[PDB]
Amino acid sequence: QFDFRASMHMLTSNLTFTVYSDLLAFVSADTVEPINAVAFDNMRIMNEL
Amino acid sequence: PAFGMQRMHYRNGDPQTPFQIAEQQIQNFQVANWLHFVNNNQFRQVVID
């Protein structure tokens, strides 16, 4: 039987989101000058003349 | 190559010129006496007239 007073339900959610997908489209990276580029140690790669 | 030793590995921007390193590493006398005049060849600033 369809009871109207016992079948009402209060559905709760949020008001406002803003959903993003591509997160690395916000950063803006850049390389240092390639003659001064350091390896895992302190010294630079391709240093010997 | 003329003394039989391994050729030197000179990195960029070292504070010593390769003649200034090779007077320590070499062991002859006649070719380490010429190599000392090249390191200490300088103009002499005197005041004339």
Side-chain angles (χ1 to χ4, degrees), chain B:
Chain B
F3 275 71
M5 61 187 74
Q6 174 156 311
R7 43 178 267 157
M8 63 149 55
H9 298 123
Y10 188 80
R11 288 180 272 272
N12 277 65
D14 260 8
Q16 288 181 313
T17 45
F19 278 177
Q20 212 153 2
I21 287 173
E23 72 172 359
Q24 303 177 358
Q25 206 167 1
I26 213 160
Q27 264 313 307
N28 208 350
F29 178 60
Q30 314 277 317
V31 81
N33 210 314
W34 163 70
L35 206 58
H36 188 78
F37 192 81
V38 189
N39 303 328
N40 289 340
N41 211 348
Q42 274 177 357
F43 280 116
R44 221 177 66 203
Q45 319 182 4
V46 310
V47 194
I48 320 184
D49 289 77

Side-chain angles (χ1 to χ4, degrees), chain A residues 3-32:
Chain A
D3 272 326
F4 196 64
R5 315 217 283 276
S7 177
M8 186 256 274
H9 296 286
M10 287 279 182
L11 263 70
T12 55
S13 89
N14 287 97
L15 266 167
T16 302
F17 300 142
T18 294
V19 186
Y20 301 94
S21 42
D22 197 2
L23 282 185
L24 294 192
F26 281 108
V27 304
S28 87
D30 183 36
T31 315
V32 77

